[PDB]
Subunit: 330 residues, 4 copies
Amino acid sequence: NLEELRTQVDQLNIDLLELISKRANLVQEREMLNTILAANEGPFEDSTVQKLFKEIFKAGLHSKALLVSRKNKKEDTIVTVKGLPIGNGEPVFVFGPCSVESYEQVAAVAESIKAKGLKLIRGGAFKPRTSPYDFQGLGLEGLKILKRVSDEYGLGVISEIVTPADIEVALDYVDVIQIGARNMQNFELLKAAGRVDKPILLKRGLSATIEEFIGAAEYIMSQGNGKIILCERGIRTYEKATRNTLDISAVPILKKETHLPVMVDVTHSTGRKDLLLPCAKAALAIEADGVMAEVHPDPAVALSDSAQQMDIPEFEEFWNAILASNLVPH
Amino acid sequence: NLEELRTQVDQLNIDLLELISKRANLVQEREMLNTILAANEGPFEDSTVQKLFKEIFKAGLHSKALLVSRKNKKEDTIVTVKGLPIGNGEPVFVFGPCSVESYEQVAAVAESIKAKGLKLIRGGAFKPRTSPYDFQGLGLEGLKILKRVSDEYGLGVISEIVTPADIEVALDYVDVIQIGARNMQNFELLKAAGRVDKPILLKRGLSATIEEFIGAAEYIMSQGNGKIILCERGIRTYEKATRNTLDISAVPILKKETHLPVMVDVTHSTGRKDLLLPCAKAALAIEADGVMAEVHPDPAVALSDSAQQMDIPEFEEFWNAILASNLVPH
Amino acid sequence: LRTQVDQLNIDLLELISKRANLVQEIGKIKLRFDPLREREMLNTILAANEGPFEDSTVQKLFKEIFKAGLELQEEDHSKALLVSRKNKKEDTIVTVKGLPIGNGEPVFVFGPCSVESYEQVAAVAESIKAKGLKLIRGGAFKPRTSPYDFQGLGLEGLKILKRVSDEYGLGVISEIVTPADIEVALDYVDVIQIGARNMQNFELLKAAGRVDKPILLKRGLSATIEEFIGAAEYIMSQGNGKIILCERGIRTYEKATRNTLDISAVPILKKETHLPVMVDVTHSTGRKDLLLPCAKAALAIEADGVMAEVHPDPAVALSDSAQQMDIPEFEEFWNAILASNLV
Amino acid sequence: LRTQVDQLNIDLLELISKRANLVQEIGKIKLRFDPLREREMLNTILAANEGPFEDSTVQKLFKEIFKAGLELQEEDHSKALLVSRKNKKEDTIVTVKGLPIGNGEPVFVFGPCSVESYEQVAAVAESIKAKGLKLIRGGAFKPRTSPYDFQGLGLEGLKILKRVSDEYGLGVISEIVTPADIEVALDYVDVIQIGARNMQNFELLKAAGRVDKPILLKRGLSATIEEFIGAAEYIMSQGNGKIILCERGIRTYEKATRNTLDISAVPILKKETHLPVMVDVTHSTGRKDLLLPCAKAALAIEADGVMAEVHPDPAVALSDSAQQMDIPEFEEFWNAILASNLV
Ligand SMILES: [Cl-]
Ligand SMILES: [Cl-]
Ligand SMILES: [Cl-]
Ligand SMILES: [Cl-]
Ligand SMILES: [Mn+2]
Ligand SMILES: [Mn+2]
Ligand SMILES: [Mn+2]
Ligand SMILES: [Mn+2]
């Protein structure tokens, strides 16, 4: 009577549905587990019985959603910079040197960005370096150079700010404040950025989890500033063929969990000039809101990322390949 | 006389170019370093002087190229399976269940693959599991099921082989032998796969470097079998939002270093059904030679990857989105 | 209401238990997995669903109920692994040529990375025997990143090892790389080593599980503790419980070392399993200057043993040239171990 | 030909050295970086190139020659970091309230994860003083993943710490999270802690480098040894050499622990630098059952100290509830440390 045994199992399956549903209604903390385990006469072990009931209690399950989550705001956040609506559906491109070395250097790149009809430029005035003996950046002087270039060539400036006291100072010179990977968990810097009315480009930490990245964005938004652009720039792994491992999957995860725009930095992730174009194409196809890459008039003598930055002729070929890819409406 | 000091530096720069070039010609092992360091009267430290000369000797610099490298064979390797030239420029798609559970299960998926005009199907007869108490696969019986399906629906079969003794046996049932991530460094298995005339789909190890992946492919090709398809399937990292981190940059690196086709497995990398489509689009745009994803008629009851496999209606929507993306000529 | 909810909880336990018993009876009256029967039960359950839960929630609860029943099967030890202290609380002692491993007194395994010749292995064996040690390691089959690097002498390497061991009274630990070589190895080795790269070569694990020979299982390059334990369970589920676990570093971003020695794995494994745990200080660090400190940490954290490489002339070694200690270095290392009072 | 090639090598050294001296004179006769002058020198060099090397190879050689010259600058210590044994061979001893740290006798730092009240910190201080210990840790500023988790009492937390320490005669170690708080902290702490998440907050490091106060620098979540040393150099290059390095585990794929304790970092750091090195066994493992074994490994590998968390009632702690030892657990832990003969 194997069919009769199965019949009874089926009947018990229905009985459990009834008991669970009847109970679920009425129930609408570890006191129950103690009593349940006291009545356990087998065949399961207490740990298993406990695990089953916890799952049943969990089933029984507001406005405690993070400000950066789609659960809080379903509509996409659009951050407009120098007329460009970052996050609207049309990708933006941010090119420029790794470090601001001189007015002439930055102007040369700006001229090449302007000629392509582009509107944004990046440049580091403050450079976080592994060693204190490497070029630390020009500081405030570099921001003044960027402002001059912005005024002359009509480009919106994105530049990294490294300490809370410099946030206020930066407001007069930049269009977007960048918080670098090494400072993604510099919480006081995040809070300072959250207290000003200026867009923030928040880079993912060297080894930050998605949850930590989201938390960091929340530090900023909880202070009042919701103009946050998230930037994937690779994560630290064992792989030596690349400087970092571009985590392309972060884009759709962030686009689904948050309402913030998401960019991809293809230079700092791969650390390889031969991977910029392929990685940019992947970023565009996966629907990133923008791509960032470094360009320098004479990379061989650059004070940072000498091998990773495209020179002007290389930037031209890269751009021409982007236009020919049909991945962009430009 | 600062200009005169610079003039002399410039003159010495030219003198060094002459000495280095004259020497380079004549020189066409650590004996030299000993003599050089003995004559060091400052200002540099021996370690620095040593480092400079090593770089100079290195400059002074065949057919020792790996069989899998473009240095050996510049032309792309094309692997034809059931009429499809994998590696020719047009991407291929490989769908199918994680495990072969029954003929009916596999046939249902095969019917859905055939209806879309596709020609390949994957299915695991041998399943490497973390625990010995999880479903290990049907074994040879599963291969016979796949062969039946291949004959009936006209699809080329890709299936994993887990031990050297099964390679010969597999030849009668599969069109492509798959070597799984956990066996990428099962060297005797690799050698066995290299001794047969059958395409091999080699998956990147859980934490394998690009160099190791290439080395593994070389184990196979050195035995005589050059019909190797490389497959990126994510690497192990600290990130918990995904099962693995899809290393999309591996595709262009492998396409540049080797002449072997390169596929991307979007299911085992992300481990998330909501990331399959976005990741597939990135793979196509970065010019992967193909994409692999899992489909099962009833994923909730699957004996492996229950949450990661698309059901038949979900497969239809995925495919329709791929067709609408304009990333494929299909 | 609480009073009534407590009654419903007891009724659920009785019904879950009764159902579980009935399903176990079906197992006897008869693959262990049956997806068709599971879908059949779900269809009936979901068709009878009248809320408050959605069909998706109901399905998840029941799948958990069904999943739980699998552990009742006598052949399934998922809830109390054979290698776990839940199965056997007492420490497993693995005896090799009279030497107990896992009894509380640490053992030391020294020897060359690769077997290169009789003379080479014999010189190391002599230095081991002089210290009163009883084990020797040596690779006859060498897993290499590139197929053009030295792969080992193979069977001839095992023969050299046996000859040297038989003369110097030492127990041999050597790596076997494929299932077919397990039977042959039985006549040449005292402990079969399964390398890091083969930790998830499941057919090899099963084959090692079918013989009565001590096995030294090395942790995979990036294996989790759970996976390492699972691999050991593949061996033991076949019948062979003579398993020694070996921590040998894990792959990380750090470039100062070859791998990152995960010292914490020792106490985790000694609490969770009853199997002895050793530490390989050569393959973890890949640095001669870290051998002694890491060996002391291993001993202090209560490892059951330490493994390290020694070669008469590391300069000419066909593997790990810079990592292996020469004979004088081995003497200094050992004297420090003796003076540490950790043994 | 070898005879003539050996002559050319000596001529190169003399010319490289003469050139280097001349370029250093230019530095005195005068930013340290000058990309325009570098391009100007390269243009002249490349224009004169007549083979055999291509312009790209020539450029690389010269860039290396120019790069080398940077280390001659008196302010550049890239070739012999101030924190390295190449700079100073002797061990740096950091004294805190009479207690030398780094002299050969290990120190122990216990205390709660977060400062919650006077009573809470005082109870822990009492248990520390009873053991004859002289240091206490406590977080007033708590770096948290989420802004909605307890951020610490701030200044009031530092005040509580000072009050308790002044009464129980203990030296205070507490985390400072932003450059502006460094000056204020001087009146409340004995050792300024820079947390893992701030290891590359360079402006904070520079500010800690400008004061005369011991600094406890924690290794970044995924920092390489090179980066950790570089961070310490940011501090010391400003003038403050009273730096204690703290290994606290690194981020890996392993889920059995919070982080992977990188025990090998201790001997690497003690060889490479002259700075004392401590190990935080609570934040590395994140597990109460691994505290004692990891502490023993740290002591055996010659760490200069060990840090661990103690809280009077971990159940109500606003951070690391499951990781902190209660008072009875602290007693058992300490008795084992004493019995180990490692101290
Ligand atoms: Cl840097
Ligand atoms: Cl699995
Ligand atoms: Cl190797
Ligand atoms: Cl936290
Ligand atoms: Mn850069
Ligand atoms: Mn699967
Ligand atoms: Mn070795
Ligand atoms: Mn804590």
